Ligand binder design. Structure first.
Ligand code: HEM
Ligand code: HEM
Ligand code: HEM
Ligand code: HEM
Lengths: 141, 146, 141, 146
């Protein structure tokens, strides 16, 4: 639902992430896979080791979708609707796993931007990550 | 909660560094800011209406410090998280009736707070170890519901 | 998100519930309170015993909102937006508790309509109850 | 999982009546229909594409019957749900890596199925007792994750 404040905050934090969003995504995936091993089952084909090239590759793609969402935050359903069919319709992704990854994304962002990860901004980023997740599982619901 | 020598190495090395003066009030404040239905449990405490109010509340930074205690406690007794948390579980379950899910959420904001504070040192392997612990504690607190 | 099928199903099941929706709501509340005691804390003023008059009273109100949602299923945010501010903004209702009540609502509906509680319809009712719940907690998210 | 004489009275009286031939396939089918990401675990089984396909699948009604077994099992040993479920917990945790939340969801669809089947006899006090049990089992299955 996101207030005018949360939008500003998400754009603020995003801009700051900058040309490092690719790397951030790879790292947030790596955190997930290590912290929540159950998520691994969905990636039987990847090599999930640390410097995996498929993890870097996939981290950029995750990052590119989140950037589309941000740039289109007032029309996320349209922006992301294709990816909802992918996730909620073909790969059948257990919705719990959207929580785990949003969590790891926040940890990654807190690890990288100690100046901009304030409470109000952590709140906005949570909300924005909950938003994206509601759209990616909407075929379910 | 089993933990390997290396996980344990990763958890205790880190935790020694931890500013037990502040982090406990960071976690609690952020919990009340990010997940506002939890303020329902601290309406006393006081000015909780804006993020700034919450983070400057003497009573938030004082209690959060109590809470980190229980956490350094569990680090001690990982082999026995339930006995350790049994009177607190009674408290949060039977007296307060806190939904166990919020035990998870606190665990996770505490991990954000350790990420914020330690930056690059809070590597993925060190986060993995802390999530095990965090899940251990939440599970312990919840027991009196089981 | 609800398909054309789920709409038909929800309206089918609802019509069948009929002038008993009041009673169904009271019963679904009673189930919740007994099965999930933690939800009780939010109702310090009610007498939660079996034949409580405040539970019947409140059961109708719950039922009346769900009927507004159904009759306005293609515009639930507007329909329910006031109640979202109530729940997500004043009473600060832990979102987990929307799950528990949706569950008890389904149990109550299964207890009452053995002919119409088929799998496809249980699926639609779940989705519709998840929909309502996403709107009632949207101020959160 | 403690259960009072009356809760236990309410659970075992009911469960004797239960058509252990069918209910186990009702629960599993409804789980796969209502929460479709679970089909990911039974893509073998077969035609799972429409609700009708799922409910008429020999393999769904056969396995669901296995599952109700484990459930009548736990009813026996409520005093000891963990030992009872330990090899299954290994299975669902370490081999399958099923998220524990889906243990909850199955528990709850099983309770819908008992509501559907017993109607008026599945009073609120009888549902309360079954949710305790259902939470007991889910908690037992999940243990190998803790
Ligand atoms: C924040 C929400 C998420 C976003 C932004 C997202 C986005 C994406 C994108 C951008 C793709 C590639 C799409 C294409 O090329 O067609 C992808 C594929 C996929 N995602 Fe996600 N995803 C998210 C969460 C998840 C989670 C929670 C899981 C489950 C653990 C998951 C599992 C996968 C799988 C299995 C595929 C295909 C990977 C492969 O087999 O190569 N995703 N995701
Ligand atoms: C993840 C685990 C958590 C830990 C380790 C924990 C720890 C503690 C500790 C140390 C106390 C003080 C008890 C004493 O004075 O002896 C306490 C009190 C309290 N906790 Fe927690 N707690 C947890 C989560 C929560 C959550 C999530 C809520 C609610 C949103 C909550 C609500 C309360 C309240 C209201 C008190 C005050 C009780 C009173 O003064 O009567 N706690 N907790
Ligand atoms: C299916 C979603 C739900 C719907 C349809 C709903 C609807 C309503 C309605 C119609 C009212 C009266 C509104 C008014 O007169 O202003 C109400 C009040 C309220 N509801 Fe809900 N509600 C839902 C779920 C919940 C849950 C999950 C809880 C938390 C356990 C909750 C707690 C309350 C409280 C505390 C009030 C005020 C009761 C009082 O103090 O008199 N509601 N609800
Ligand atoms: C609430 C608790 C549940 C119980 C009591 C339970 C019980 C069982 C039992 C009796 C078996 C047979 C094991 C054997 O043959 O010795 C089994 C197998 C299986 N379960 Fe569950 N289970 C539960 C939930 C689930 C869930 C939620 C999923 C996934 C969506 C799942 C996926 C599987 C799969 C795929 C198998 C087959 C393993 C194989 O044949 O190699 N189970 N479960």
């Amino acid at each position: 639902v996101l207030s005018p404040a949360d939008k500003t905050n998400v754009k603020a934090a995003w801009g700051k992430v900058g040309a490092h969003a690719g790397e951030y995504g790879a790292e947030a995936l790596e955190r997930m896979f290590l912290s929540f091993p159950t998520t691994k089952t969905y990636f039987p084909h990847f090599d999930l080791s640390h410097g995996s090239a498929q993890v870097k590759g996939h981290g950029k793609k995750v990052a590119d979708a989140l950037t589309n969402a941000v740039a289109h935050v007032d029309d996320m359903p349209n922006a992301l609707s294709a990816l909802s069919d992918l996730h909620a319709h073909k790969l059948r992704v257990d919705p719990v796993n959207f929580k785990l990854l949003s969590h790891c994304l926040l940890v990654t962002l807190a690890a990288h931007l100690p100046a901009e990860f304030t409470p109000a901004v952590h709140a906005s980023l949570d909300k924005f990550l909950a938003s994206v997740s509601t759209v990616l599982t909407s075929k379910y619901r | 909660v089993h933990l390997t020598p290396e996980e344990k190495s990763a958890v205790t090395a880190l935790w020694g560094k931890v500013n037990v003066d502040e982090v406990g009030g960071e976690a609690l404040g952020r919990l009340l800011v990010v997940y506002p239905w939890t303020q329902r449990f601290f309406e006393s405490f006081g000015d909780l209406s804006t993020p700034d109010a919450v983070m400057g509340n003497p009573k938030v930074k004082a209690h959060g410090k109590k809470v980190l205690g229980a956490f350094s406690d569990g680090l001690a007794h990982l082999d026995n998280l339930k006995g350790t948390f049994a009177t607190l579980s009674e408290l949060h379950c039977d007296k307060l009736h806190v939904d166990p899910e919020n035990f998870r959420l606190l665990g996770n904001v505490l991990v954000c707070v350790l990420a914020h504070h330690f930056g690059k040192e809070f590597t993925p392997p060190v986060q993995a170890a802390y999530q095990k612990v965090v899940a251990g504690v939440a599970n312990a607190l919840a027991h009196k519901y089981h």
